[PDB]
Symmetry: C3
Amino acid sequence: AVKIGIIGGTGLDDPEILEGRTEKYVDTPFGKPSDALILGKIKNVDCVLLARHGRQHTIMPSKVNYQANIWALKEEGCTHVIVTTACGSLREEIQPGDIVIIDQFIDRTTMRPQSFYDGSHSCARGVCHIPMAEPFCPKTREVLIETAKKLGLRCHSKGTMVTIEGPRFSSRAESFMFRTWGADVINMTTVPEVVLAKEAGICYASIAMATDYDCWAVSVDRVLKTLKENANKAKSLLLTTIPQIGSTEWSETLHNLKNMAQFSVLLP
Amino acid sequence: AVKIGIIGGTGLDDPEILEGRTEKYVDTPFGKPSDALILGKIKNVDCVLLARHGRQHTIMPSKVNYQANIWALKEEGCTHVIVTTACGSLREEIQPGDIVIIDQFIDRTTMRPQSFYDGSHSCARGVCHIPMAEPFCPKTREVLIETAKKLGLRCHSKGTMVTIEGPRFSSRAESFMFRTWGADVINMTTVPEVVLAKEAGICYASIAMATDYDCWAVSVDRVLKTLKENANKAKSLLLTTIPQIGSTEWSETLHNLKNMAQFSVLLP
Amino acid sequence: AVKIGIIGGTGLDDPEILEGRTEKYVDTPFGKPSDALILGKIKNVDCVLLARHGRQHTIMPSKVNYQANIWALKEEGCTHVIVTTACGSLREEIQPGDIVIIDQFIDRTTMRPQSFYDGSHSCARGVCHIPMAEPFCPKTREVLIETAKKLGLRCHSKGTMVTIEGPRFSSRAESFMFRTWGADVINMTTVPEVVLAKEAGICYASIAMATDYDCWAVSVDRVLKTLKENANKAKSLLLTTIPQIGSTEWSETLHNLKNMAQFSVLLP
Ligand SMILES: CSC[C@H]1O[C@@H](n2cnc3c(N)ncnc32)[C@H](O)[C@@H]1O
Ligand SMILES: CSC[C@H]1O[C@@H](n2cnc3c(N)ncnc32)[C@H](O)[C@@H]1O
Ligand SMILES: CSC[C@H]1O[C@@H](n2cnc3c(N)ncnc32)[C@H](O)[C@@H]1O
């Protein structure tokens, strides 16, 4: 049995996506999650929805409690976690409104805890050095790509996301530099969310939605405008993808993730 | 009416630049500024001078309260902020003693608050994502460039400043890497000073003074020696530029900056 | 007279390397060192051994008290500090099991104090801007290189170490990016250890041991396995190098390091 956690990004966190909804506030050894967990279903699959920035969007990227968010979903029984995120495009072919099923990342964050094993919590003892060669779940990404195709949506099969600290946008010199590094899209929330999911042994995948071309003219109003016009795409993709995930086998995949996570910890 | 704030860098903060001086200690919601504000005039223009590292240079770059400094100047009524900064040259044509009117930056800092909107101060509520495509005021930069020309000074019309955390200087491998990224000069204080000025709706410009060629032989004694020999240039440039700024129209420019700052904030 | 401090890395910290051993716990103005100092000798040379991650390896790279470790060694009278470190290879010619006598570094750390002069300790007052053009002691590196040759070991004469924050390993996009920057090997502990040693006026050198090819397949088990198989090399290199260092003159070298450190401090 699978249980899908869903973390909604800026203007991509509509609770009406689930049927038979029930609100539930929880606590974790790492503090409180961004907001209440919303329990429900999509067809016959159990899901858990969470707004990354809170229902009223009051939390900046640097202040999101990524540890609490991932821990709460893991504690609720989530085997998979599929998220949505607004991002800027660093490539001509990635047009605003396009979806990108990212497969790699480049870290540019500075003030964020990236591990549960900080030597100050009973629940996670020791030192953890988690592998990051393949940060996103290939099987989940494969289903997302095929589903976008069946839906006729403009979608890119791969892409490298550079995550900046924020909250400011990048300068033009930074924008051009990121392109030479191999980055394709840019945001402020992929890291450490993807890292902590891996430590928890969860299959993590991300639906990135391009909202602008950065500055290589971006502004809050421009970002919000593009999201309003295209949010239906991410909603349709999730509704159609989820039942598909719940109809296939994940025993072997989840076992391997559990092993990788367990054997990355160094005990005294 | 305009009021020019002036933030003086290492060995480039002489108070005798203003006439009719008056010392004034202030406080801000973000703490105390580096030192007392010095109120005075240059011809008929009102100015406010502030020493970035304190009068006795006792504050390292990482510890400067950039938030308090910018907030205090904004509170005093400053419409413009022109600063001075010592820097290393990463380009053969930028010789020690040369002035560079920078137009871009690359952030390499790690432990610095870059926004007033940290969700813990009544005066700045919400989440702010300020645009950084054009970090420095083009009109102010234009006047600085033309004035340097009238003064016959060696001056570069543009340049990208890479700001490192410090307090240590860069390694040789880092120095060469910065050059491949497109950086032209290097310092430890441009970021987040330029970012916070933008959030405040202030016209910000920077007078960078090359003091060495980094290491692609730099030392504290070498830096201080070059500054002593060339400080008169920055002083002459400011004295001649300021009356020029006070004789032109800034209503439309200040209005646009105010709009950009206001529309970058996301409210609950 | 010389006194060699030795900081042992992951699986490269065997105390049996010294004769006439005596355990000694100390304290510093910056807190407690990773573990007790082990006083002893190699032939006729006085040495001080310290385990970077503690005897039971319970401290992650981000949490190591680099300030306390370097301060404690300096306080004990150490003139030299030679360390061991496990690392990943970013170059085909650097094979797992090979030794690399590094000569440069690229900083990718974010949450680490890199100076003793933080303006909050009586023992180190003022602002220090230490030069980093040549981070490692050339004379000590020369002896290590010649000794490895006499021992017939596969050893590289130079190399650039990129130090990441950790504790996670790098993504594949990051791995490829580091190669384009000029990095040859990768670890999580060189910075700020090398920086603080320079501030203390100590001759610092590093014996890097390649344990894998990063991901341009790395895992904790793979790293530990390679170290177990090759640890004897680092031990033999240290035992043979140390008596050689104790037989040559260091007065002029130590004097120059002391001058560089003293003249990098800015007093009120
Ligand atoms: C609300 S505008 C910025 C927010 O949307 C995302 N974003 C959209 N476009 C960009 C961009 N060009 N650069 C960085 N983040 C972006 C970021 O993750 C942040 O949470
Ligand atoms: C006092 S020497 C270092 C100081 O001067 C500036 N500086 C001058 N040359 C350099 C350089 N090569 N690299 C970094 N900062 C430099 C920095 O902003 C710091 O405040
Ligand atoms: C125990 S595996 C990671 C530890 O060994 C070193 N290390 C070995 N291989 C690598 C690698 N590929 N990337 C980063 N650190 C590495 C790091 O400094 C850390 O303390």
